[PDB]
Every structure is written in structure tokens, then in C-alpha cells.
Amino acid sequence: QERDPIWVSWSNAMHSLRVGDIDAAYAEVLCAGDQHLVIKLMDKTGPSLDQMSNEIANEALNFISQFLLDHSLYDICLSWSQQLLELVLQDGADTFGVPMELKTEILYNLQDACSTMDPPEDWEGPAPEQLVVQLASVWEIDLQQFDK
């Protein structure tokens, strides 16, 4: 008889949040494997790329890239994408040290979501097409070179 280890991880993460260590909270949950706990954490904190190390930001963006393929997570993905754009505009295109492959996956997956799903009902940010056009520009990726 022992607790599911994911809840011990969650407890460690909640303590980290209590003391303001968002980076450590993410490091714990992103490592615990469990997708539903990653979503649970993101739902609680909101977009948190401004409080993360490059290493943890890259782990989080890897999840966002995968989440973009799921229409139930579109709101979350747009919110994080918007924050990412704002931060790369402010702190520099390469501030987070995201590799070109991941940059490309994020754009490709966001463009795909944009093409197939409608903006969530409560979404109030830029049109999804504006996010992907602007992010592609900052990252110097030509969206029209993706094949249709």
C-alpha cells in the first residue's frame, strides 16, 4: 500500500508554488510523466514562461506542441503561444534557446490547429492566424514553404 507517486510529485509541486518557485513546480510535474497533471498545473498557474529557466520552458513548450494536436486544449495552447510571442518580442527571438526543430514543430502544429479548429468561445487574444504569422516572422520561418 503506497500513494500513487504522481500525488507525491504533485504535493512537492504545490509546496514549490506556495513558496513562489514556479520553475521547480514545473520541473517536478513535467518529469512525473503524467499529462493530466501537466494540464492541471498549467490550468492553475496560467502561462508561466516568464518564471521559467530555458530548460523548463523547453520542456513545457514540448508539451504545448503536442497539446496543439488536441482540440480540448486549444485555449491553453493559444494562451501559452501568445505569451511566448510576447516574450520573444521583448527579450529576443532566441531568449529561451528553443532549437529550430522545436520552433518549427510549434509553428507547424499551431498553423494546423488554426486551419482545422475554431477559436475557443472565450478566447480574447489575437486571432490565431495573427499569432502564427507573428511568431513565424520573429523566428524567420516562412509559413508559405510548408506544403499544402
Numbering used by the authors: 717 to 864
Reproduce, without paraphrasing, sentences from the article in which this PDB structure was first reported.
The crystal belonged to the space group P212121, with one SPR2 molecule in the asymmetric unit, and a solvent content of 35% (calculated using the complete SPR2 649–864 construct, thus representing a lower limit for the solvent content if the construct was degraded). Selenium sites were identified and used to phase the structure, yielding clear, interpretable electron density (Final 2mFo-DFc electron density shown in Fig 3B), for which residues 717–849 (which includes the construct’s carboxy-terminal residue) were modeled. SPR2 residues 717–849 form a right-handed α-solenoid helix-turn-helix structure, composed of seven conserved α-helices (α1-α7). Six of the seven α-helices form anti-parallel helix-turn-helix pairs (α2-α3, α4-α5, and α6-α7) that pack against one another. Of these repeats, the SPR2 C-terminal domain helix-turn-helix motifs are structurally most similar to FANC repeats, as the helices are relatively straight, and lack a canonical kink present in the first helix (helix A) of a HEAT repeat, or the additional N-terminal helix (helix H1) of an ARM repeat. Collectively, conservation mapping suggests that the domain face formed by α1, α3, α5, and the α6-α7 loop is likely to constitute a functional surface, potentially for protein-protein interactions, mediated by both hydrophobic and electrostatic interactions. On the conserved face of the domain, charge is partitioned, with a basic patch localized to the α1-α3 region. The domain fold is similar to, yet structurally distinct from the C-terminal domain of Ge-1 (an mRNA decapping complex factor involved in P-body localization) and, surprisingly, the C-terminal domain of the katanin p80 regulatory subunit. Based on these differences, we do not anticipate that SPR2 engages katanin p60 using a p80-binding mode.
The molecular mechanism underlying this microtubule array reorientation involves katanin, a microtubule severing enzyme, and a plant-specific microtubule associated protein called SPIRAL2. Upon severing, SPIRAL2 binds nascent microtubule minus ends and limits their dynamics, thereby stabilizing the longitudinal array while the lateral array undergoes net depolymerization. The domain architecture of SPR2 family members is distinct from CAMSAP proteins, as the former contains a predicted N-terminal TOG domain, a central coiled-coil, and a helical C-terminal domain of unknown structure. To gain insight into SPIRAL2 structure and function, we determined a 1.8 Å resolution crystal structure of the Arabidopsis thaliana SPIRAL2 C-terminal domain.
